[PDB]
């Protein structure tokens with residue numbers, strides 16, 4: 001698998017924009033599924049509680065990010 | 071999530087930075103496969119001749135990118 005899904009269930013990251021997010025490693029947000037819509041994420045895209053994040057990167061950082069976010 | 075592969079066959083864009091690419095649409099480069107390895111693309115990342123660009127986004131702009139990069 002190369003596309004992983006992570007739930008954004010951490011209140012500490014609400015309204016935090018991708019351009020300021022402190023990534024656990026080399027990761028790109030491929031899509032964010034929010035309110036039944038699939039968004040192509042960019043720098044000023046803000047995380048929201050309940051977001052379904054579709055991410056790609058090495059399993060390590062993905063796992064790392066997963067722990068912090070959900 | 072649809073991903074599309076685009077070959078970087080246009081020397082016009084070689085060495086150009088992702089932060090400096092003129093995007094005319096809603097698109098993200100999910101992966102670049104370069105020198106037999108699969109890499110995660112960022113702002114500094116350069117397009118290099120022969121790159122296999124894996125992209126996601128508005129299909130209309132994917133199509134324009136394919137014109138620019140591999141036609």
Ligand SMILES: Nc1ncnc2c1ncn2[C@@H]1O[C@@H]2COP(=O)(O)O[C@H]3[C@@H](O)[C@H](n4cnc5c(N)ncnc54)O[C@@H]3COP(=O)(O)O[C@H]2[C@H]1O
Nearest residue numbers: 018019028029041042043044088089098099111112113114
């Ligand atoms: N995979 C990709 N596909 C297409 N273009 C790409 C790209 N990765 C980087 N870029 C382009 O480079 C900018 C520079 O990227 P950078 O990684 O330095 O700087 C970024 C980055 O760390 C964060 N960001 C934006 N989108 C992101 C994403 N999908 N995943 C992770 N971080 C993102 O916001 C900073 C400013 O974002 P902004 O989009 O307004 O500005 C973008 C975008 O035009």
